[PDB]
């Protein structure tokens, strides 16, 4: 019903839903055969990877 897309006591757990998805992929294979922190850190890693004279010989 959820794939097709009141008060009830019929709910489907995510554990069972993931198992149904996995088993359906098994059946399909048989039928055929028959992060901002990460980006900031990498950006920082990529980034880091006559003259002049003032005063003179006298005591101010």
């Amino acid at each position: 019903q959820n794939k097709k897309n009141s008060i009830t006591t019929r709910t489907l757990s995510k554990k069972r839903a993931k198992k149904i998805e996995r088993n359906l992929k098994y059946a399909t294979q048989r039928k055929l055969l028959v992060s901002s922190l990460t980006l900031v850190k990498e950006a920082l890693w990529s980034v880091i990877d006559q003259g002049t004279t003032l005063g003179g010989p006298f005591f101010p």
Partner: protein
């Protein structure tokens, strides 16, 4: 998570719960039953009147040797009470449910209490000393309360050959 009952199409529902609440299980069961099925704002105004002692909560199951009142007549009973602690806990959960529905964007004028459930929490075990050096239990009976509000919205027959022949004859007779 894991309510006693859920809403199909949860996009039009909001829920609230409170666990291990140190309030009388029996009084709260009667309060939640007085609320069950109502429109939300109507329930809130009713509970305010109950605290004001203008209307009353009917006591239907846990009511042995309760007094009688004239405010029970609206619900067709004689035994009704005004449990303040229960009403305040239930009002807190109702306000939370309304807040959740507003955060979801539900229409507050169409919300009604589609589910409300009171279960027994684990007991609070005090003891009392009694005559002849006895220890007796002296316990609190707390509640788990949960509730869901919801927006209110608005042939093959097999005939025998005899039956088929009768129908065909009827059609031939008729126009």
């Amino acid at each position: 998570a894991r309510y006693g009952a859920t809403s199909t199409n949860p996009a039009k529902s909001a829920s609230a719960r409170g666990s291990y609440l140190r309030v009388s299980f029996k009084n709260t069961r009667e309060t939640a039953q007085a609320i069950n099925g109502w429109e939300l704002t109507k329930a809130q105004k009713y509970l305010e009147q109950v605290l004001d002692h203008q209307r009353a909560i009917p006591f239907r199951r846990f009511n042995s040797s309760i007094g009688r009142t004239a405010q029970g007549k609206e619900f067709g009973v004689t035994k009704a009470r005004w449990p303040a602690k229960s009403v305040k806990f239930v009002q807190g959960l109702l306000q939370n449910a309304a807040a959740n529905a507003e955060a979801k964007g539900l229409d507050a004028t169409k919300l009604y209490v589609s589910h409300i459930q009171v279960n027994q929490a684990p007991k609070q075990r005090r003891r009392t000393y009694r005559a002849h050096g006895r220890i007796n239990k002296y316990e609190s009976s707390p509640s788990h309360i949960e509730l869901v509000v919801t927006e209110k919205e608005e042939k093959v027959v097999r005939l025998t050959s005899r039956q088929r022949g009768r129908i065909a004859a009827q059609k031939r007779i008729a126009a």
